[model samples]
Target: MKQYLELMQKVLDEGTQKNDRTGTGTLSIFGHQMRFNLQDGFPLVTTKRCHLRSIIHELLWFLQGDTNIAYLHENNVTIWDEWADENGDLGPVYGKQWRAWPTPDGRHIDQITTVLNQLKNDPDSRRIIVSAWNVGELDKMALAPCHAFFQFYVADGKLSCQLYQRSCDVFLGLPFNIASYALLVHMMAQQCDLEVGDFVWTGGDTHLYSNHMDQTHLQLSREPRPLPKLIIKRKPESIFDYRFEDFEIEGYDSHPGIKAPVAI
Candidate 1:
């Protein structure tokens, strides 16, 4: 967790102040990376309390290839409401690109399904990849993909994943990105009948909005505790089959939740 703390401190110390598309000026840095060996523990931030609800729901929503916020609203999550239109649509965002990428011939490529097949059968293959940066569909998205692309690797009966995030809001989005991909790795490893391995996160244009400075300082003053255990109650037939009730976190000891404004 020192790595995470180091990252936050680095940006605060040396990053440049820059304006963004959201008009929330930021102390921005570029080309940063972090790694978490799942064998150590889940890389959840311990300085401030975090929840699995929003992250799980968001991942499940992505797996469903949904473009609307209705599902999230029904689940009592309002994280994406700001970006969604009056009709609750976010256009062709992560879910659509990840699970059902379109082609000129009217064929939709199931990226997640392809990833599963690769892991299950061709375990040694380096071609295991799932990409969300559909260049042609950028304008259609409510917000362009920030955590744009990621790759998977299999070694020594363990599954590893690396995500290349194009844009990042360090204060709000990085924690979610880390947790979301970490959960995804755990799921992939479970279905493939392998041990969980490392999650390598690489970020571009990493930044902290001006509004979140005080909260950041308060969180940094704390120490990281033992990473919690992510227990899956039942082995779902497929990743998409998972329900909110099926996941639980145990032994999570941490400081209180730190609230920060979201960049719209």
Candidate 2:
């Protein structure tokens, strides 16, 4: 948690200002990364409360290989609300690109499932990767992916994952992104019968929007609490079979929630 606070302080003090598509300006930077050992605890933001429900459901939704926002909406999750069309479709987004990534030959592949299989059967394979930045499908997406791609690394019988996010709204999105991916790694490790390993988060265009500068500073002034723990209830045997209630977070003690409008 101290690492997260350090990142916010560093970005605020050193980042450059820039304008973006959302009409909101930003204090932008080129590259930044944070690593978390899952054994320490879940890498959730404790400085300001973050909703674990949406994060869990969103990950589950992505694992389900769904491009539509209907499931998210039905679960009362509004994180993707602004980007969805009238029918709640986000077209070829993270889930579709990760799971049902369509190839030129009319075949669909589930990268999550594939990666898990690789980790279990071929631990030393360097090809254990999942990419959401499909150049061919970018045009069809309502919004281009910010956290675009991720790769898994298995060593010492432990599973680790690294995400490459091409762009980020640091104050608002980065924290959630960190927790979401770390949880994904935990889930993947459980399925593979491997111990929880490291989560390396790599980012590009990682910036704090100008509108959030004051808030960022405020958060920096606060001290981080102990890292929280996440509890997933289901034993679905397959990655794709997880549901909303299948996940839960316990031992999360944090400050009150912070509210900020999305850039969209």
Error of 2 at 194 (Å): 0.7
Among residues 3 or more apart in sequence or in different chains, the pairs in candidate 2 whose N, CA or C atoms overlap within 3 Å are: none
By lDDT, who's the top model here?
A: 1
lDDT of 2 by residue, 1-264 (tens): 788888888778888887888598878778888889988989999989887888988998888887888888888999898889898899999999888889999999888778888887888888889998889999999988888888889888788999999988778888889988998887888788888889998888878877787788778878889887778776677777777787777888888777776555
C-alpha-based local distance difference test score of model 2: 0.85
lDDT of candidate 1 over 126-197, digit per residue (tens): 889999999989998999998899999999999999999988888787887898999999888888889999
Off by over 4 Å in 2: 262-264
C-alpha lDDT of residue 126 in model 2 = 82
Number of backbone collisions per candidate? 0, 0
